[PDB]
Design the sequence.
RNA sequence: AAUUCUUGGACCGGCGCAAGACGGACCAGAGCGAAAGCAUUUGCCAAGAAUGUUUUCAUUAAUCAAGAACGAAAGUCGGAGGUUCGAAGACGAUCAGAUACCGUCGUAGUUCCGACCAUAAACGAUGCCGACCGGCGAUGCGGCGGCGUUAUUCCCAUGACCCGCCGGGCAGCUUCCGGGAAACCAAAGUCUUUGGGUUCCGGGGGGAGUAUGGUUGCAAAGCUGAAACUUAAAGGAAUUGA
């Protein structure tokens, strides 16, 4: 194809493309409010953590770091947050 | 073996492989067990085991990677022992031992933000243990003997929410959390526990000071409930006075008079408030409201029972007291409900409640 | 490594024009590329273009009209004196009718015919015909 | 591509367009600076501090929340290490390789990888000398390299 | 066929023992390594590309005279070892002859440790870094999303398949991208419409990688390296014949 709008690409094209090769680069990661059932409180965790985030005063382990995204513990309500 | 310099830097590299994908999970408690059994000196074994002893029983809840599953009889047992070795050393040495200066070492944990909530890290183990036990009861065949074999551990759980209750060096005002955890193992307790230590005629049967220390725990509700009423109505959060008073109402029932109880229900105004509340309390309300008319029935009021127990039994969802019932509508939410299902022994019986709406009418 | 940015930008336009593409995204945007493309537009070889700000070196999307035979660069930037602009425009451009040598002078970035008129020599950037 | 390898890896961080701070974040400029001080005091490098902050607290950049960069904050208060924390890691690596090579003298691969690491030390060391964050006397030589931590 | 081995029991079958090599099939247009090269199990030691990242420093980079590390095989010196194979040798055949191919033995060597050596059709006969320019289906490593099948029965959650996407890597098929003397090549393209950066290096065929000096080596030999003289061709791809 000759005629393609490189200025107005539909958002499925940009979500497909590598994060650096979009028309303006943006992170694939996000922040999410994760709370364990026992406690009352919501602690901010990064998607691709790479540290073992703990609930206050060493209550329990909250997320496990892996190659890509972090494994959140089984029995934890996570709400990814937007700005 | 040296100057707590080779036990604060081997306790700072075995609680560092915690949660990690190559955890080991099992033989990490062994290396936290082989920094106390090869700790045989003062302030190197017989002083500061406390900081290790927090992370020897915290290492036993992490053995299970899931929080929907229960500790095995083996794991459950050893963590009822290791919570008590904590209390062998924190009773007969009255002081704080994750800070609050005495000499120099191995106490004095000031550099670490607050040596007070790492100190308040014992109430959150006996609270985590209080909730951990409930899963042991939720995953047993309740018509099997294996239910009774597990309810024999209820004399051992009620003990530690009492041994770490008397302990008043909080750091009234901030202790009320262990008060609710204590009263929660007293609110559904029956007549012959609460009566047949008052009812053994108080003469030369029960009138010595510590023979009348089995007479502590009939009305433990009188003392500890008002403390979770008029410190908590002064303090920040809500949960431990809504829950506190319904345990009180339910315990002014089935072994005490109606008039004493029904007043408390109308004082707090939970007839027209428990709508914006969370479900975990919204069932304790239903449990209370049902026991009201059941104990009104017990004394004689056989039409006051009727007009109160209508809106509960009217529904096909009369399992707002117990293990939930039938057909589909969002399965993922119905797995957020099997972790709500209240414990079998506590349950108001249903062939007993249908026999008060065809016996009052 | 990427030594010359204008060199990349003009090769990108040239490749896209041959292949018959209608617009092309030349990446590492710079003052020299934009000032080159304005001159190229004012004679009417390219269309209107739109420069895209990420908080870095920007991008440019150039709307291409099929009236561009070649857009090349001369590296290094040789110091073209005014009298020698004849022998340059003799051996670079197709004929004495059309085609332009754009060169960066004291005044600003402008083509050989303007620089000849203003009476200024300068450093050569490239050519377009 | 990579300096001392044939690889051509395209895999790094991609900052968002918006340099603004998010609404949810209640930590202030001075609150983050106070925690940056405490983390560095405990004994931690600018790389680890930034990781621990944005994993646990939710701080995309210190540069967007505060005004300044982490090392810039540390070396104002005076907590910054003497030689930089990238030249430190290259030297410590060279020490560990050279110690392994002392015992395993038949390791010709370890010998070759030591030449690449020490070449990269020399290369980065002189950059810092021109910028004047090392005294011009400064000389990495293997005999008195193990003593530099 | 003979040389050779054997009734002082060879070859063959059985049970043991010792030695020194080598790691079959699985093993692929698969993987790793700067190249040479690298395969039984397990442990220890240090290193590494790729992916992932809303961490950090902020031009620290690309290619390189001098100088330097590694460099199959054969070869050299000293020590240990010598099962198999085997330059020279010794014979047995073959042939007109056979100093060869074929056979029976067989020394240096083949293996390990410590010192030299520095060349190979060391090959992709194809410097390294960067950009742009078609399509398609697989494949190895990492990440991401997704019907369903299956193992942990107790399934959350992990592996094995299944269907796509993104980034690096070994390759493949296809085409009037384009190039080329053609063979062929997504580079060997973007080249008379000739300039992104930089190192090495060729100038008709022989003489000749020869002589001479200098330099490295214990030696073999390596690196640098002409001239007189001789000659109209030598050569590369492709076509038709024989």
Sequence:
């Amino acid at each position: 194809p000759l005629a393609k709008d490189l200025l107005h690409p539909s958002p499925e094209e940009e979500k497909r493309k590598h994060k650096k090769k979009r028309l303006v680069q943006s992170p694939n990661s996000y922040f999410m409010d994760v709370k364990c059932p026992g406690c009352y409180k919501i602690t901010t965790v990064f998607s691709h953590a790479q540290t073992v985030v703990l609930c206050v005063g060493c209550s329990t382990v909250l997320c496990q770091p892996t190659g890509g995204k972090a494994r959140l513990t089984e029995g934890c309500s996570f709400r990814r947050k937007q700005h | 073996e040296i100057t707590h310099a080779v036990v604060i830097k081997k306790l700072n590299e075995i609680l560092q492989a915690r949660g990690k994908k190559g955890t080991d999970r099992a033989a990490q408690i062994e290396l936290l067990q082989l920094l106390v059994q090869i700790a045989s000196e003062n302030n190197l074994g017989e002083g500061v085991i406390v900081k290790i002893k927090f992370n020897i029983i915290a290492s036993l809840y992490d053995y299970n990677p899931n929080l929907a599953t229960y500790m095995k009889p083996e794991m459950w047992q050893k963590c009822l022992d290791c919570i008590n070795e904590l209390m062998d050393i924190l009773f007969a040495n009255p002081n704080i031992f994750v800070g609050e200066n005495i000499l120099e070492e191995s106490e004095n944990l000031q550099n670490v933000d607050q040596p007070l909530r790492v100190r308040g890290c014992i109430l959150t183990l006996v609270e985590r243990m209080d909730e951990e036990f409930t899963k042991i009861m939720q995953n047993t065949d309740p018509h099997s003997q294996e239910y009774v074999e597990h309810l024999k551990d209820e004399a051992q759980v009620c003990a530690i929410i009492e041994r770490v209750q008397r302990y008043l060096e909080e750091k009234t005002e901030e202790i009320c959390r262990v008060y609710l955890r204590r009263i929660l193992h007293t609110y559904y307790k029956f007549d012959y526990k609460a009566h047949q230590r008052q009812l053994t005629p108080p003469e030369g049967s029960s009138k010595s000071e510590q023979d009348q220390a089995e007479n502590e725990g009939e009305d433990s509700a009188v003392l500890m409930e008002r403390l979770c009423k008029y410190i908590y109505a002064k303090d920040r959060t809500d949960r431990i006075r809504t829950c506190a008073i319904l345990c009180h109402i339910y315990h002014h029932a089935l072994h005490s008079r109606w008039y004493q109880a029904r007043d408390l229900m109308l004082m707090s105004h939970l007839q027209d408030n428990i709508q914006h509340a969370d479900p975990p309390v919204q069932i304790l309300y239903n449990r209370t409201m049902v026991q009201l008319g059941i104990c009104a029935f017990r004394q004689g009021l056989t039409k006051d029972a009727h007009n109160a127990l209508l809106d509960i039994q009217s529904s096909g969802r009369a399992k707002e007291l117990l293990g939930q019932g039938l057909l589909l509508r969002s399965l993922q939410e119905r797995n957020q409900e099997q972790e709500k299902v209240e414990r079998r022994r506590q349950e108001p019986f249903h062939l007993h409640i249908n026999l008060e709406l065809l016996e009052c009418v | 490594v990427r030594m010359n940015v204008l060199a990349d930008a003009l090769k990108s336009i040239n490749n896209a024009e041959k292949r018959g593409k209608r617009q092309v995204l030349i990446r590492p945007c710079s003052k020299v590329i934009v000032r080159f493309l304005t001159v190229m537009m004012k004679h009417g070889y390219i269309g209107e273009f739109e420069i895209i700000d990420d908080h870095r070196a920007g991008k440019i999307v150039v709307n291409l009209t099929g009236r561009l035979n070649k857009c090349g660069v001369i590296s290094p930037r040789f110091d073209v004196q005014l009298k020698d602009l004849e022998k340059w425009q003799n051996n670079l451009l197709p004929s004495r009718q059309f085609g332009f040598i754009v060169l960066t002078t004291s005044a600003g970035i402008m083509d050989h015919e303007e620089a000849r008129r203003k009476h200024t020599g300068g450093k050569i950037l490239g050519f377009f015909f | 591509g990579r300096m001392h390898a044939p690889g051509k890896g395209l895999s790094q961080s991609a900052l968002p367009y918006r340099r603004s701070v998010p609404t949810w974040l209640k930590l202030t400029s001075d609150d983050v600076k106070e925690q940056i001080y405490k983390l560095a005091k405990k004994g931690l490098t600018p790389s680890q501090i930034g990781v621990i902050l944005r994993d646990s607290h939710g701080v995309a950049q210190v540069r967007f929340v505060t005004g300044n960069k982490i090392l810039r904050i540390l070396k104002s208060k005076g907590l910054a290490p003497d030689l930089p924390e990238d030249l430190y890691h290259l030297i410590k690596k060279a020490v560990a390789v050279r110690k392994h090579l002392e015992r395993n003298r038949k390791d010709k691969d370890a010998k070759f990888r030591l030449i690449l690491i020490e070449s990269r030390i020399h290369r980065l060391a002189r950059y810092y000398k021109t910028k004047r964050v090392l005294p011009p006397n400064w000389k990495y030589e293997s005999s008195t390299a193990s003593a530099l931590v």
User: Anything to note?
Assistant: The domain at 1-83 of chain A is CATH 2.20.25.100 (N-terminal domain of TfIIb). Chain A is about 5% helix and 20% strand. Residues 15-21, 26-31, 46-50, 66-69, 71, 74-75 of chain A lie near RNA strand E (CB under 10 Å from a C1').
